[PDB]
Protein backbone atom coordinates (compact mmCIF):
# COMPACT_ATOMS: atom_id res chain seq x y z
CA UNK A 1 0.00 0.00 0.00
CA UNK A 2 0.95 3.66 -0.45
CA UNK A 3 2.82 5.10 2.53
CA UNK A 4 1.95 8.68 3.52
CA UNK A 5 5.26 9.83 2.03
CA UNK A 6 4.41 8.21 -1.30
CA UNK A 7 0.99 9.87 -1.33
CA UNK A 8 2.85 13.10 -0.61
CA UNK A 9 5.11 12.62 -3.63
CA UNK A 10 2.15 12.04 -5.96
CA UNK A 11 0.28 15.06 -4.58
CA UNK A 12 3.32 17.25 -5.20
CA UNK A 13 4.00 15.92 -8.71
CA UNK A 14 0.36 16.28 -9.78
CA UNK A 15 0.40 19.89 -8.55
CA UNK A 16 3.77 20.70 -10.12
CA UNK A 17 2.40 19.46 -13.43
CA UNK A 18 -0.85 21.41 -13.16
CA UNK A 19 1.18 24.56 -12.60
CA UNK A 20 3.43 23.96 -15.60
CA UNK A 21 1.05 22.51 -18.19
CA UNK A 22 -1.87 24.68 -19.35
CA UNK A 23 -4.37 22.34 -21.04
CA UNK A 24 -6.05 25.35 -22.67
CA UNK A 25 -2.75 26.19 -24.38
CA UNK A 26 -3.57 29.90 -24.04
CA UNK A 27 0.06 31.03 -24.36
CA UNK A 28 0.53 29.59 -27.84
CA UNK A 29 -0.69 32.94 -29.12
CA UNK A 30 2.61 34.49 -28.00
CA UNK A 31 4.68 32.24 -30.29
CA UNK A 32 5.82 33.32 -33.74
CA UNK A 33 2.86 32.31 -35.99
CA UNK A 34 2.80 28.90 -37.67
CA UNK A 35 3.12 28.85 -41.46
CA UNK A 36 1.77 25.86 -43.38
CA UNK A 37 2.26 25.78 -47.15
CA UNK A 38 10.35 27.00 -47.39
CA UNK A 39 11.08 23.53 -45.90
CA UNK A 40 11.38 25.31 -42.55
CA UNK A 41 8.18 27.35 -42.54
CA UNK A 42 7.09 25.78 -39.24
CA UNK A 43 10.46 26.20 -37.49
CA UNK A 44 9.85 29.63 -35.93
CA UNK A 45 6.55 28.55 -34.35
CA UNK A 46 7.72 25.11 -33.21
CA UNK A 47 11.08 26.40 -31.95
CA UNK A 48 9.13 28.86 -29.79
CA UNK A 49 6.85 26.06 -28.64
CA UNK A 50 9.88 23.98 -27.68
CA UNK A 51 11.62 26.88 -25.94
CA UNK A 52 8.48 27.63 -23.95
CA UNK A 53 8.15 23.96 -23.07
CA UNK A 54 11.74 23.72 -21.92
CA UNK A 55 10.92 26.45 -19.38
CA UNK A 56 7.87 24.54 -18.18
CA UNK A 57 9.85 21.31 -17.83
CA UNK A 58 12.41 23.14 -15.68
CA UNK A 59 9.63 24.53 -13.49
CA UNK A 60 8.32 20.97 -13.11
CA UNK A 61 11.75 19.54 -12.36
CA UNK A 62 12.37 22.02 -9.52
CA UNK A 63 9.29 20.71 -7.71
CA UNK A 64 10.38 17.05 -7.84
CA UNK A 65 10.78 15.79 -4.26
CA UNK A 66 14.51 15.57 -3.60
CA UNK A 67 15.61 17.46 -6.70
CA UNK A 68 16.54 20.41 -4.47
CA UNK A 69 19.16 18.35 -2.59
CA UNK A 70 21.11 18.07 -5.85
CA UNK A 71 23.93 20.45 -6.77
CA UNK A 72 23.50 23.18 -9.36
CA UNK A 73 25.82 21.40 -11.80
CA UNK A 74 24.02 18.06 -11.49
CA UNK A 75 20.67 19.77 -11.94
CA UNK A 76 21.91 21.34 -15.17
CA UNK A 77 23.15 18.03 -16.56
CA UNK A 78 19.89 16.23 -15.76
CA UNK A 79 17.76 18.93 -17.41
CA UNK A 80 19.98 19.34 -20.47
CA UNK A 81 19.81 15.63 -21.29
CA UNK A 82 16.16 15.01 -20.39
CA UNK A 83 14.52 18.16 -21.83
CA UNK A 84 13.64 16.84 -25.27
CA UNK A 85 12.55 13.53 -23.67
CA UNK A 86 10.24 15.18 -21.14
CA UNK A 87 8.82 17.36 -23.89
CA UNK A 88 8.08 14.19 -25.86
CA UNK A 89 6.48 12.60 -22.80
CA UNK A 90 4.47 15.64 -21.77
CA UNK A 91 3.30 16.08 -25.37
CA UNK A 92 1.43 12.77 -25.10
CA UNK A 93 -1.27 14.74 -23.27
CA UNK A 94 -2.22 16.57 -26.49
CA UNK A 95 -1.40 13.69 -28.84
CA UNK A 96 -4.45 12.04 -30.39
CA UNK A 97 -4.67 8.69 -32.16
CA UNK A 98 -7.65 9.94 -34.17
CA UNK A 99 -5.35 11.42 -36.82
CA UNK A 100 -1.87 10.92 -35.34
CA UNK A 101 -1.39 14.55 -34.36
CA UNK A 102 -0.94 16.86 -31.39
CA UNK A 103 -4.21 18.79 -30.89
CA UNK A 104 -3.52 21.96 -28.93
CA UNK A 105 -6.99 23.51 -28.94
CA UNK A 106 -7.29 24.82 -32.50
CA UNK A 107 -6.51 23.99 -36.13
CA UNK A 108 -3.71 26.55 -36.09
CA UNK A 109 -2.22 24.79 -33.07
CA UNK A 110 -2.81 21.25 -34.32
CA UNK A 111 0.42 19.63 -35.47
CA UNK A 112 0.87 16.60 -37.72
CA UNK A 113 3.73 14.79 -39.43
CA UNK A 114 3.72 17.35 -42.26
CA UNK A 115 4.11 20.23 -39.79
CA UNK A 116 7.01 18.57 -37.96
CA UNK A 117 8.81 17.84 -41.21
CA UNK A 118 8.53 21.57 -41.91
CA UNK A 119 10.55 22.23 -38.77
CA UNK A 120 13.63 20.68 -40.34
CA UNK A 121 13.34 17.01 -39.36
CA UNK A 122 12.97 13.79 -41.36
CA UNK A 123 10.91 10.61 -40.95
CA UNK A 124 14.05 8.87 -39.68
CA UNK A 125 13.00 10.56 -36.44
CA UNK A 126 9.36 11.58 -36.93
CA UNK A 127 7.99 8.11 -37.65
CA UNK A 128 9.61 6.63 -34.52
CA UNK A 129 8.32 9.61 -32.49
CA UNK A 130 4.75 9.00 -33.68
CA UNK A 131 5.14 5.29 -32.94
CA UNK A 132 6.33 6.27 -29.45
CA UNK A 133 3.30 8.54 -28.87
CA UNK A 134 0.85 5.83 -29.96
CA UNK A 135 2.40 3.19 -27.72
CA UNK A 136 2.47 5.59 -24.77
CA UNK A 137 -1.11 6.71 -25.36
CA UNK A 138 -2.25 3.09 -25.40
CA UNK A 139 -0.94 2.68 -21.86
CA UNK A 140 -3.76 4.98 -20.69
CA UNK A 141 -1.61 6.10 -17.80
CA UNK A 142 -3.28 7.69 -14.81
CA UNK A 143 -2.22 11.32 -14.53
CA UNK A 144 -0.37 10.06 -11.41
CA UNK A 145 1.71 7.61 -13.43
CA UNK A 146 2.33 10.23 -16.14
CA UNK A 147 3.87 12.72 -13.72
CA UNK A 148 5.96 10.07 -11.96
CA UNK A 149 7.34 8.88 -15.31
CA UNK A 150 8.43 12.40 -16.27
CA UNK A 151 10.05 12.84 -12.85
CA UNK A 152 11.82 9.47 -13.11
CA UNK A 153 13.04 10.43 -16.63
CA UNK A 154 14.52 13.71 -15.34
CA UNK A 155 16.29 12.15 -12.34
CA UNK A 156 18.27 9.52 -14.25
CA UNK A 157 21.67 8.61 -12.67
CA UNK A 158 23.25 7.44 -15.92
CA UNK A 159 23.18 10.74 -17.81
CA UNK A 160 26.71 11.71 -18.88
CA UNK A 161 28.41 14.35 -16.74
CA UNK A 162 26.59 13.36 -13.57
CA UNK A 163 28.66 13.71 -10.41
CA UNK A 164 26.63 12.53 -7.42
CA UNK A 165 25.06 9.67 -9.37
CA UNK A 166 24.21 7.81 -6.18
CA UNK A 167 22.15 10.68 -4.83
CA UNK A 168 20.40 10.94 -8.19
CA UNK A 169 19.70 7.21 -7.94
CA UNK A 170 18.36 7.47 -4.40
CA UNK A 171 16.06 10.27 -5.51
CA UNK A 172 14.92 8.28 -8.56
CA UNK A 173 14.38 5.05 -6.59
CA UNK A 174 11.96 6.84 -4.28
CA UNK A 175 9.93 7.91 -7.32
CA UNK A 176 10.14 4.44 -8.90
CA UNK A 177 8.97 2.71 -5.72
CA UNK A 178 6.14 5.22 -5.47
CA UNK A 179 5.20 4.38 -9.05
CA UNK A 180 5.46 0.60 -8.64
CA UNK A 181 3.41 0.69 -5.45
CA UNK A 182 0.84 3.06 -6.97
CA UNK A 183 0.32 0.69 -9.90
CA UNK A 184 -0.22 -2.21 -7.51
CA UNK A 185 -2.69 -0.29 -5.35
CA UNK A 186 -4.54 2.11 -7.64
CA UNK A 187 -4.28 0.65 -11.13
CA UNK A 188 -6.80 -2.16 -11.84
CA UNK A 189 -5.95 -5.18 -14.01
CA UNK A 190 -5.69 -5.85 -16.90
CA UNK A 191 -4.46 -2.29 -17.45
CA UNK A 192 -1.80 -2.85 -14.78
CA UNK A 193 -0.34 -5.93 -16.47
CA UNK A 194 3.42 -5.36 -16.67
CA UNK A 195 2.60 -1.65 -16.67
CA UNK A 196 5.76 -0.69 -14.78
CA UNK A 197 7.98 -2.70 -17.13
CA UNK A 198 6.21 -1.06 -20.08
CA UNK A 199 6.73 2.42 -18.68
CA UNK A 200 10.43 1.82 -18.11
CA UNK A 201 10.54 0.58 -21.71
CA UNK A 202 9.26 3.97 -22.92
CA UNK A 203 12.24 5.58 -21.16
CA UNK A 204 14.48 3.29 -23.21
CA UNK A 205 12.58 4.33 -26.33
CA UNK A 206 13.22 7.96 -25.34
CA UNK A 207 16.99 7.38 -25.25
CA UNK A 208 16.86 6.30 -28.93
CA UNK A 209 14.72 9.31 -29.81
CA UNK A 210 17.07 11.59 -27.88
CA UNK A 211 20.07 10.17 -29.75
CA UNK A 212 18.54 10.64 -33.19
CA UNK A 213 17.34 14.06 -32.12
CA UNK A 214 20.85 15.16 -31.16
CA UNK A 215 22.10 14.11 -34.61
CA UNK A 216 19.38 15.91 -36.53
CA UNK A 217 19.64 18.98 -34.30
CA UNK A 218 23.32 19.21 -35.20
CA UNK A 219 22.41 19.02 -38.88
CA UNK A 220 19.55 21.52 -38.64
CA UNK A 221 21.51 24.01 -36.54
CA UNK A 222 24.59 23.46 -38.73
CA UNK A 223 23.82 26.39 -41.03
CA UNK A 224 23.83 29.68 -39.07
CA UNK A 225 20.79 30.59 -41.18
CA UNK A 226 18.64 28.02 -39.35
CA UNK A 227 20.11 28.31 -35.85
CA UNK A 228 19.08 31.92 -36.36
CA UNK A 229 15.41 30.79 -36.29
CA UNK A 230 15.70 29.19 -32.85
CA UNK A 231 15.67 30.85 -29.43
CA UNK A 232 18.53 31.60 -27.03
CA UNK A 233 17.22 29.00 -24.54
CA UNK A 234 16.87 26.34 -27.21
CA UNK A 235 20.44 27.00 -28.36
CA UNK A 236 21.86 26.85 -24.84
CA UNK A 237 20.02 23.64 -23.88
CA UNK A 238 20.20 21.58 -27.11
CA UNK A 239 23.71 22.81 -27.85
CA UNK A 240 25.72 25.38 -29.79
Amino acid sequence: KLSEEQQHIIAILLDAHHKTYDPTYADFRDFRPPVRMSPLSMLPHLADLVSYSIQKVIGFAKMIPGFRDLTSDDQIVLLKSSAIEVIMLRSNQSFTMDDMSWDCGSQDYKYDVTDVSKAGHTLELIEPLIKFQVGLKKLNLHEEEHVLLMAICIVSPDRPGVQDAKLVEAIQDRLSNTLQTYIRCRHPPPGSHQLYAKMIQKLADLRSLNEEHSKQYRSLSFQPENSMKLTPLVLEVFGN
Binding site: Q55, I58, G59, A61, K62, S72, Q75, I76, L79, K80, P232, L233, E236, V237
Partner: peptide
Amino acid sequence: KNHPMLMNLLK
Protein backbone atom coordinates in the same frame (compact mmCIF):
# COMPACT_ATOMS: atom_id res chain seq x y z
CA LYS B 1 30.26 24.64 -20.72
CA ASN B 2 28.20 27.55 -19.44
CA HIS B 3 24.41 27.48 -19.18
CA PRO B 4 23.49 30.85 -17.63
CA MET B 5 19.85 30.77 -18.75
CA LEU B 6 19.28 27.20 -17.65
CA MET B 7 20.95 28.01 -14.32
CA ASN B 8 18.89 31.16 -13.81
CA LEU B 9 15.68 29.19 -14.39
CA LEU B 10 16.63 26.34 -12.05
CA LYS B 11 16.99 29.14 -9.50
